[PDB]
């Protein structure tokens, strides 16, 4: 398990339908990216929305 991937089971538990960013990503626009992941890319924030596929909404890319 990694930052940027969320399993279908957890997605179901979160009530997060596919093709949607997890609810905490909106707050990251205001407050900033994770202090422990300076190189985190999130689709639709600082990574092309085309990469939001399946379990993936982000990825640590330097």
């Amino acid at each position: 398990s990694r930052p940027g991937r969320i399993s279908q089971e957890l997605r179901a538990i979160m009530n997060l339908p596919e093709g949607q960013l997890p609810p905490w990503c909106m707050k990251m626009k205001d407050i900033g990216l994770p202090t422990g992941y300076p190189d985190l890319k999130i689709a639709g924030l600082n990574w092309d929305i085309t990469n939001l596929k399946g379990d993936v909404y982000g990825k640590i890319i330097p």
């Binding site: 905490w24 707050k27 407050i31 994770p34 992941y37």
Partner: protein, 176 residues
């Protein structure tokens, strides 16, 4: 400093799943997720330890009242209550009289909060125990107090009193 208290966790949530959630927010050192030994269930809360104070503080800012797991809103703080809606209070009915009327049914966690809709004097009353809250409903719903006929039921959060308040029982057992 580097550990956060997580509250309001549906007991079906596993520890793997807590890890999977919180590693989205920052890298996680360990998780203490207490199990009630008698019931072999989890108790509604956990402790998540990050690597430093900064990541924890970040987590609290981002995660607090952002995520619903099994529909319930998760709380994140540094370092599960019976709330009733009372409608149609008389002008006479102080905050103090509410305390006296509901005291006899059980312990109150905080003082009442009074507010007005539409003319219509209402209050929130906060019980430690859903068992005690039930008695107060049974005894006072649709009854006459200071010549006004009141209603008493659980407040909206959609309502308090759901089954998954065995979290109330665990917290009473383990003394908050």
């Amino acid at each position: 400093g580097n550990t956060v208290y997580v509250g309001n966790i549906d007991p079906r949530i596993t520890k793997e799943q807590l890890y999977e959630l919180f590693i989205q927010i920052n890298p996680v050192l360990r998780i203490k997720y207490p199990k009630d030994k008698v019931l072999q269930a989890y108790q509604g809360y956990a402790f998540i330890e990050f690597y430093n104070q900064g990541d924890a503080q970040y987590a609290i800012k981002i995660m607090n009242n952002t995520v619903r797991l099994y529909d319930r809103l998760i709380k994140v703080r540094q370092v599960p209550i019976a709330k009733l809606f009372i409608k149609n209070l008389a002008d006479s009915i102080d905050s103090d009289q509410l305390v006296k009327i509901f005291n006899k049914f059980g312990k109150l966690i905080r003082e009442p909060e009074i507010f007005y809709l539409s003319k219509l004097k209402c209050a929130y009353v906060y019980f430690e125990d859903f068992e005690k809250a039930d008695l107060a409903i049974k005894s006072l719903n649709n009854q006459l107090v200071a010549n006004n006929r009141i209603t008493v039921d659980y407040a909206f959060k959609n309502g308090k009193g759901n089954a998954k308040y065995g979290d109330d029982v665990d917290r009473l057992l383990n003394k908050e």
